[PDB]
Design a binder for this molecule. Structure first.
Ligand code: FE
Ligand code: FE
Lengths: 192, 192
Protein backbone atom coordinates (compact mmCIF):
# COMPACT_ATOMS: atom_id res chain seq x y z
CA UNK A 1 0.00 0.00 0.00
CA UNK A 2 1.40 3.39 -1.01
CA UNK A 3 1.81 5.97 1.75
CA UNK A 4 1.95 9.77 1.71
CA UNK A 5 5.60 10.91 1.94
CA UNK A 6 6.38 13.15 4.88
CA UNK A 7 7.24 16.79 4.17
CA UNK A 8 10.65 17.70 5.66
CA UNK A 9 9.37 21.19 6.57
CA UNK A 10 6.21 22.81 7.91
CA UNK A 11 3.38 23.64 5.46
CA UNK A 12 4.11 27.39 5.70
CA UNK A 13 7.91 27.04 5.57
CA UNK A 14 8.31 27.79 1.83
CA UNK A 15 6.67 31.24 2.08
CA UNK A 16 6.83 33.54 0.32
CA UNK A 17 7.82 31.35 -2.67
CA UNK A 18 4.96 28.90 -2.15
CA UNK A 19 2.14 29.68 0.24
CA UNK A 20 0.86 27.48 3.03
CA UNK A 21 -2.48 27.42 1.19
CA UNK A 22 -0.76 26.03 -1.92
CA UNK A 23 0.95 23.33 0.15
CA UNK A 24 -2.32 22.49 1.91
CA UNK A 25 -3.99 21.88 -1.49
CA UNK A 26 -1.01 20.68 -3.55
CA UNK A 27 0.28 18.17 -0.98
CA UNK A 28 -2.76 17.72 1.23
CA UNK A 29 -5.35 17.23 -1.55
CA UNK A 30 -3.76 16.62 -4.97
CA UNK A 31 -1.00 14.27 -3.83
CA UNK A 32 -3.39 12.55 -1.41
CA UNK A 33 -5.78 11.91 -4.31
CA UNK A 34 -3.02 10.53 -6.51
CA UNK A 35 -1.91 8.17 -3.72
CA UNK A 36 -5.51 7.13 -3.00
CA UNK A 37 -6.08 6.57 -6.74
CA UNK A 38 -2.98 4.38 -7.04
CA UNK A 39 -4.06 2.30 -4.03
CA UNK A 40 -7.52 1.90 -5.66
CA UNK A 41 -6.23 1.01 -9.13
CA UNK A 42 -3.55 -1.55 -8.27
CA UNK A 43 -5.22 -4.39 -6.26
CA UNK A 44 -5.42 -7.59 -8.30
CA UNK A 45 -3.24 -6.26 -11.16
CA UNK A 46 0.30 -6.97 -12.25
CA UNK A 47 1.23 -3.67 -10.56
CA UNK A 48 0.22 -4.87 -7.10
CA UNK A 49 3.25 -4.97 -4.79
CA UNK A 50 5.45 -2.99 -7.24
CA UNK A 51 7.19 0.25 -6.29
CA UNK A 52 5.99 3.56 -7.66
CA UNK A 53 9.23 3.81 -9.65
CA UNK A 54 8.70 0.35 -11.19
CA UNK A 55 5.15 1.28 -12.22
CA UNK A 56 6.34 4.49 -13.83
CA UNK A 57 9.07 2.53 -15.64
CA UNK A 58 6.70 -0.15 -16.92
CA UNK A 59 3.11 0.99 -17.32
CA UNK A 60 1.72 2.16 -20.67
CA UNK A 61 -0.37 5.36 -20.94
CA UNK A 62 -3.40 5.10 -18.72
CA UNK A 63 -4.74 5.85 -15.27
CA UNK A 64 -2.18 3.75 -13.42
CA UNK A 65 0.69 5.47 -15.19
CA UNK A 66 -0.92 8.88 -14.68
CA UNK A 67 -1.29 8.36 -10.94
CA UNK A 68 2.04 6.62 -10.35
CA UNK A 69 3.85 9.28 -12.32
CA UNK A 70 2.14 12.01 -10.29
CA UNK A 71 2.99 10.27 -7.03
CA UNK A 72 6.63 10.00 -8.02
CA UNK A 73 6.77 13.54 -9.45
CA UNK A 74 5.23 15.12 -6.34
CA UNK A 75 7.29 13.03 -3.94
CA UNK A 76 10.58 14.21 -5.50
CA UNK A 77 9.19 17.72 -5.91
CA UNK A 78 8.22 18.37 -2.33
CA UNK A 79 11.24 16.63 -0.86
CA UNK A 80 13.70 18.65 -3.03
CA UNK A 81 12.81 21.92 -1.24
CA UNK A 82 13.96 23.46 2.05
CA UNK A 83 13.00 26.74 3.77
CA UNK A 84 16.47 28.32 3.72
CA UNK A 85 18.96 26.28 1.69
CA UNK A 86 22.59 26.62 2.81
CA UNK A 87 23.72 26.64 -0.81
CA UNK A 88 21.80 28.19 -3.69
CA UNK A 89 23.78 26.14 -6.20
CA UNK A 90 25.11 22.58 -6.57
CA UNK A 91 28.69 21.57 -5.87
CA UNK A 92 30.80 18.48 -6.33
CA UNK A 93 30.03 16.08 -9.20
CA UNK A 94 26.64 17.65 -9.92
CA UNK A 95 28.22 21.11 -10.07
CA UNK A 96 30.82 19.81 -12.56
CA UNK A 97 28.30 17.90 -14.68
CA UNK A 98 26.22 21.09 -14.96
CA UNK A 99 29.25 23.11 -16.09
CA UNK A 100 30.11 20.35 -18.58
CA UNK A 101 26.60 19.96 -20.03
CA UNK A 102 25.25 23.51 -19.85
CA UNK A 103 28.40 25.67 -19.89
CA UNK A 104 27.54 27.04 -16.42
CA UNK A 105 25.00 26.96 -13.61
CA UNK A 106 23.61 30.33 -14.78
CA UNK A 107 23.08 28.99 -18.29
CA UNK A 108 21.50 25.85 -16.85
CA UNK A 109 19.06 28.07 -14.90
CA UNK A 110 18.16 29.91 -18.09
CA UNK A 111 17.44 26.68 -20.00
CA UNK A 112 15.51 25.21 -17.05
CA UNK A 113 13.39 28.34 -16.72
CA UNK A 114 12.70 28.32 -20.46
CA UNK A 115 11.65 24.67 -20.43
CA UNK A 116 9.41 25.36 -17.43
CA UNK A 117 7.77 28.44 -18.96
CA UNK A 118 7.58 26.98 -22.47
CA UNK A 119 5.76 23.74 -21.54
CA UNK A 120 2.26 24.20 -22.93
CA UNK A 121 -0.53 22.82 -20.70
CA UNK A 122 0.15 20.58 -17.68
CA UNK A 123 3.46 18.87 -16.97
CA UNK A 124 6.90 18.87 -15.36
CA UNK A 125 10.24 20.34 -16.36
CA UNK A 126 12.92 17.84 -15.37
CA UNK A 127 16.64 17.76 -15.00
CA UNK A 128 17.75 14.13 -15.23
CA UNK A 129 20.92 12.07 -15.79
CA UNK A 130 21.27 9.25 -18.33
CA UNK A 131 23.25 6.03 -17.80
CA UNK A 132 26.44 7.56 -19.25
CA UNK A 133 26.33 10.39 -16.68
CA UNK A 134 25.06 13.02 -19.14
CA UNK A 135 22.42 15.55 -17.98
CA UNK A 136 19.22 16.38 -19.83
CA UNK A 137 16.34 18.80 -19.47
CA UNK A 138 13.01 17.31 -20.57
CA UNK A 139 9.44 18.50 -20.65
CA UNK A 140 7.25 15.72 -19.25
CA UNK A 141 3.55 16.15 -20.19
CA UNK A 142 0.87 15.60 -17.60
CA UNK A 143 1.91 12.84 -15.17
CA UNK A 144 4.99 11.67 -17.04
CA UNK A 145 8.39 11.31 -15.35
CA UNK A 146 11.89 10.69 -16.87
CA UNK A 147 12.05 7.20 -15.29
CA UNK A 148 9.90 5.96 -18.18
CA UNK A 149 12.74 6.85 -20.58
CA UNK A 150 15.36 5.20 -18.31
CA UNK A 151 16.62 8.56 -16.98
CA UNK A 152 17.30 9.25 -13.32
CA UNK A 153 15.33 12.34 -12.19
CA UNK A 154 17.22 15.01 -10.24
CA UNK A 155 15.24 18.29 -10.15
CA UNK A 156 11.75 19.33 -11.27
CA UNK A 157 9.36 22.20 -11.61
CA UNK A 158 5.66 21.35 -11.52
CA UNK A 159 3.95 23.59 -14.08
CA UNK A 160 0.47 22.24 -13.55
CA UNK A 161 -1.45 25.40 -12.71
CA UNK A 162 -2.45 24.03 -9.27
CA UNK A 163 1.21 24.35 -8.34
CA UNK A 164 1.15 28.16 -8.61
CA UNK A 165 -2.30 29.49 -9.40
CA UNK A 166 -3.35 30.43 -5.85
CA UNK A 167 -0.13 32.41 -5.38
CA UNK A 168 0.77 33.66 -8.90
CA UNK A 169 -2.37 33.08 -10.97
CA UNK A 170 -1.31 33.15 -14.65
CA UNK A 171 2.23 34.38 -13.86
CA UNK A 172 4.03 31.06 -14.23
CA UNK A 173 7.40 32.68 -15.04
CA UNK A 174 7.39 34.61 -11.78
CA UNK A 175 6.76 31.41 -9.81
CA UNK A 176 9.49 29.52 -11.65
CA UNK A 177 12.03 32.28 -10.95
CA UNK A 178 11.28 32.17 -7.20
CA UNK A 179 11.76 28.36 -6.92
CA UNK A 180 15.57 28.64 -7.16
CA UNK A 181 15.57 30.16 -3.66
CA UNK A 182 14.11 27.00 -2.03
CA UNK A 183 15.97 24.21 -3.85
CA UNK A 184 17.80 21.96 -1.38
CA UNK A 185 20.88 21.16 -3.44
CA UNK A 186 22.07 18.59 -0.86
CA UNK A 187 19.01 16.50 -1.69
CA UNK A 188 19.37 17.04 -5.41
CA UNK A 189 23.09 16.14 -5.39
CA UNK A 190 22.35 12.83 -3.69
CA UNK A 191 20.04 11.87 -6.53
CA UNK A 192 22.96 11.89 -8.97
CA UNK B 1 -5.85 41.38 -36.72
CA UNK B 2 -7.37 39.33 -33.92
CA UNK B 3 -9.69 41.05 -31.44
CA UNK B 4 -10.90 40.10 -27.95
CA UNK B 5 -14.50 38.83 -28.16
CA UNK B 6 -17.01 40.89 -26.22
CA UNK B 7 -18.49 39.17 -23.15
CA UNK B 8 -22.30 39.17 -23.32
CA UNK B 9 -22.51 39.65 -19.52
CA UNK B 10 -20.64 41.57 -16.83
CA UNK B 11 -17.50 40.02 -15.30
CA UNK B 12 -19.30 39.28 -12.00
CA UNK B 13 -22.54 38.08 -13.59
CA UNK B 14 -21.86 34.31 -13.41
CA UNK B 15 -21.41 34.24 -9.61
CA UNK B 16 -21.36 32.00 -7.77
CA UNK B 17 -20.76 29.46 -10.57
CA UNK B 18 -17.73 31.38 -11.80
CA UNK B 19 -16.38 34.29 -9.76
CA UNK B 20 -15.60 37.76 -10.99
CA UNK B 21 -11.97 37.05 -10.08
CA UNK B 22 -11.95 33.98 -12.34
CA UNK B 23 -13.42 35.92 -15.25
CA UNK B 24 -10.99 38.82 -14.67
CA UNK B 25 -8.05 36.35 -14.96
CA UNK B 26 -9.51 33.77 -17.37
CA UNK B 27 -10.83 36.29 -19.90
CA UNK B 28 -8.86 39.39 -18.98
CA UNK B 29 -5.40 37.73 -18.77
CA UNK B 30 -5.34 34.20 -20.27
CA UNK B 31 -7.52 34.95 -23.31
CA UNK B 32 -5.85 38.34 -23.75
CA UNK B 33 -2.44 36.60 -23.89
CA UNK B 34 -3.66 34.07 -26.46
CA UNK B 35 -5.00 36.87 -28.66
CA UNK B 36 -1.83 38.94 -28.18
CA UNK B 37 0.21 35.86 -29.14
CA UNK B 38 -1.80 35.45 -32.35
CA UNK B 39 -1.18 39.12 -33.20
CA UNK B 40 2.54 38.59 -32.48
CA UNK B 41 3.01 35.32 -34.32
CA UNK B 42 0.70 35.25 -37.34
CA UNK B 43 1.51 38.45 -39.37
CA UNK B 44 4.30 37.65 -41.84
CA UNK B 45 3.36 33.95 -42.11
CA UNK B 46 1.19 31.91 -44.46
CA UNK B 47 -1.59 32.33 -41.85
CA UNK B 48 -1.75 36.10 -42.25
CA UNK B 49 -5.30 37.29 -42.95
CA UNK B 50 -6.88 33.92 -42.02
CA UNK B 51 -9.64 33.49 -39.42
CA UNK B 52 -8.98 31.77 -36.12
CA UNK B 53 -11.16 28.85 -37.29
CA UNK B 54 -9.14 28.45 -40.51
CA UNK B 55 -5.87 28.45 -38.56
CA UNK B 56 -7.17 25.77 -36.21
CA UNK B 57 -8.31 23.73 -39.23
CA UNK B 58 -4.95 24.04 -41.06
CA UNK B 59 -2.00 24.65 -38.73
CA UNK B 60 0.24 21.81 -37.51
CA UNK B 61 1.23 21.38 -33.86
CA UNK B 62 3.08 24.40 -32.58
CA UNK B 63 2.64 27.82 -31.07
CA UNK B 64 0.35 29.29 -33.73
CA UNK B 65 -1.98 26.31 -33.45
CA UNK B 66 -1.81 26.40 -29.65
CA UNK B 67 -2.81 30.03 -29.55
CA UNK B 68 -5.46 29.84 -32.26
CA UNK B 69 -7.03 26.77 -30.69
CA UNK B 70 -7.16 28.54 -27.31
CA UNK B 71 -8.63 31.68 -28.85
CA UNK B 72 -11.36 29.68 -30.52
CA UNK B 73 -11.99 27.49 -27.45
CA UNK B 74 -12.29 30.47 -25.08
CA UNK B 75 -14.37 32.52 -27.49
CA UNK B 76 -17.02 29.79 -27.77
CA UNK B 77 -16.70 29.04 -24.05
CA UNK B 78 -17.36 32.49 -22.71
CA UNK B 79 -20.04 33.32 -25.27
CA UNK B 80 -22.02 30.11 -24.53
CA UNK B 81 -22.91 31.29 -20.99
CA UNK B 82 -25.63 33.57 -19.63
CA UNK B 83 -26.46 34.44 -15.99
CA UNK B 84 -30.11 33.36 -16.47
CA UNK B 85 -30.54 31.16 -19.57
CA UNK B 86 -34.04 31.06 -21.08
CA UNK B 87 -34.10 27.23 -20.86
CA UNK B 88 -32.22 24.65 -18.76
CA UNK B 89 -31.94 22.25 -21.68
CA UNK B 90 -31.85 22.45 -25.49
CA UNK B 91 -34.94 22.34 -27.67
CA UNK B 92 -35.60 22.16 -31.41
CA UNK B 93 -33.21 20.22 -33.63
CA UNK B 94 -30.46 20.11 -30.99
CA UNK B 95 -32.88 18.73 -28.40
CA UNK B 96 -33.92 15.95 -30.77
CA UNK B 97 -30.35 15.17 -31.88
CA UNK B 98 -29.34 14.77 -28.23
CA UNK B 99 -32.23 12.36 -27.60
CA UNK B 100 -31.26 10.46 -30.76
CA UNK B 101 -27.53 10.23 -30.04
CA UNK B 102 -27.48 9.95 -26.23
CA UNK B 103 -30.89 8.48 -25.40
CA UNK B 104 -31.81 11.58 -23.35
CA UNK B 105 -30.57 14.97 -22.17
CA UNK B 106 -29.90 13.46 -18.71
CA UNK B 107 -27.73 10.72 -20.14
CA UNK B 108 -25.95 13.27 -22.34
CA UNK B 109 -25.17 15.32 -19.20
CA UNK B 110 -23.79 12.23 -17.49
CA UNK B 111 -21.47 11.39 -20.40
CA UNK B 112 -20.42 15.04 -20.78
CA UNK B 113 -19.62 15.22 -17.06
CA UNK B 114 -17.61 12.00 -17.26
CA UNK B 115 -15.59 13.30 -20.20
CA UNK B 116 -15.01 16.58 -18.35
CA UNK B 117 -13.97 14.98 -15.07
CA UNK B 118 -11.99 12.19 -16.75
CA UNK B 119 -9.76 14.37 -18.94
CA UNK B 120 -6.29 14.09 -17.36
CA UNK B 121 -4.28 17.33 -17.40
CA UNK B 122 -5.29 20.43 -19.41
CA UNK B 123 -7.93 20.35 -22.12
CA UNK B 124 -11.56 20.78 -23.19
CA UNK B 125 -14.57 18.48 -23.16
CA UNK B 126 -16.51 19.14 -26.36
CA UNK B 127 -19.89 18.38 -27.78
CA UNK B 128 -19.67 18.68 -31.57
CA UNK B 129 -21.65 17.73 -34.70
CA UNK B 130 -20.12 15.94 -37.69
CA UNK B 131 -21.06 16.61 -41.33
CA UNK B 132 -23.79 13.93 -41.29
CA UNK B 133 -25.54 15.66 -38.36
CA UNK B 134 -24.36 13.18 -35.72
CA UNK B 135 -23.23 14.42 -32.29
CA UNK B 136 -19.99 13.48 -30.55
CA UNK B 137 -18.32 14.12 -27.22
CA UNK B 138 -14.54 14.45 -27.46
CA UNK B 139 -11.74 15.21 -25.04
CA UNK B 140 -9.47 17.79 -26.65
CA UNK B 141 -6.02 17.97 -24.99
CA UNK B 142 -4.44 21.33 -24.24
CA UNK B 143 -5.34 23.88 -26.94
CA UNK B 144 -6.99 21.48 -29.37
CA UNK B 145 -10.49 22.10 -30.74
CA UNK B 146 -12.85 19.80 -32.76
CA UNK B 147 -12.50 22.01 -35.87
CA UNK B 148 -9.12 20.36 -36.51
CA UNK B 149 -10.95 17.04 -36.98
CA UNK B 150 -13.60 18.65 -39.22
CA UNK B 151 -16.28 18.74 -36.48
CA UNK B 152 -18.48 21.74 -35.70
CA UNK B 153 -18.10 22.63 -31.99
CA UNK B 154 -21.29 23.26 -29.99
CA UNK B 155 -20.57 23.16 -26.23
CA UNK B 156 -17.45 22.94 -24.11
CA UNK B 157 -16.10 22.74 -20.59
CA UNK B 158 -12.60 24.15 -20.06
CA UNK B 159 -10.83 21.83 -17.63
CA UNK B 160 -7.56 23.72 -17.55
CA UNK B 161 -7.17 24.34 -13.83
CA UNK B 162 -7.17 28.14 -14.30
CA UNK B 163 -10.84 27.80 -15.28
CA UNK B 164 -11.88 26.70 -11.79
CA UNK B 165 -8.99 26.71 -9.34
CA UNK B 166 -9.66 30.13 -7.76
CA UNK B 167 -13.25 29.09 -7.01
CA UNK B 168 -13.15 25.29 -6.53
CA UNK B 169 -9.45 24.50 -6.11
CA UNK B 170 -9.00 20.77 -6.77
CA UNK B 171 -12.77 20.05 -6.89
CA UNK B 172 -13.19 19.90 -10.66
CA UNK B 173 -16.34 17.75 -10.50
CA UNK B 174 -18.14 20.38 -8.43
CA UNK B 175 -17.28 23.07 -10.98
CA UNK B 176 -18.49 20.90 -13.86
CA UNK B 177 -21.81 20.22 -12.12
CA UNK B 178 -22.46 23.96 -11.57
CA UNK B 179 -21.81 24.97 -15.20
CA UNK B 180 -25.10 23.46 -16.43
CA UNK B 181 -26.99 26.30 -14.70
CA UNK B 182 -25.37 28.98 -16.90
CA UNK B 183 -25.36 27.27 -20.32
CA UNK B 184 -27.20 29.52 -22.76
CA UNK B 185 -28.90 26.87 -24.85
CA UNK B 186 -30.14 29.52 -27.32
CA UNK B 187 -26.52 30.18 -28.24
CA UNK B 188 -25.60 26.54 -28.34
CA UNK B 189 -28.63 25.59 -30.49
CA UNK B 190 -27.66 28.14 -33.12
CA UNK B 191 -24.23 26.53 -33.47
CA UNK B 192 -25.85 23.36 -34.81
FE1 FE C 1 1.28 19.13 -8.93
FE1 FE D 1 -9.05 28.39 -20.23
Amino acid sequence: MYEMPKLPYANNALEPVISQQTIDYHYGKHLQTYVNNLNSLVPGTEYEGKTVEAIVASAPDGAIFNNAGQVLNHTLYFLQFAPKPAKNEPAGKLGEAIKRDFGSFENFKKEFNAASVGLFGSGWAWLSVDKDGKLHITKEPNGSNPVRAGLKPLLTCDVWEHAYYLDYQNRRADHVNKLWEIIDWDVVEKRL
